[PDB]
């Protein structure tokens, strides 16, 4: 979600969203199918 697998500067901005202290996110995902799920970065 958030635009991911495609795009990680949505799901950057969605982790930013969750809180400021977050400089962004990245996309990773589970033993099947692409990188659905937004894993956040400080």
Do not use: V
């Amino acid at each position: 979600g958030f635009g991911c697998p495609g795009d990680a500067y949505q799901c950057s901005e969605h982790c930013r969203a969750l809180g400021g202290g977050r400089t962004g996110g990245y996309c990773a995902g589970p033993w099947y199918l692409g990188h659905p799920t937004c894993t956040c970065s400080f």
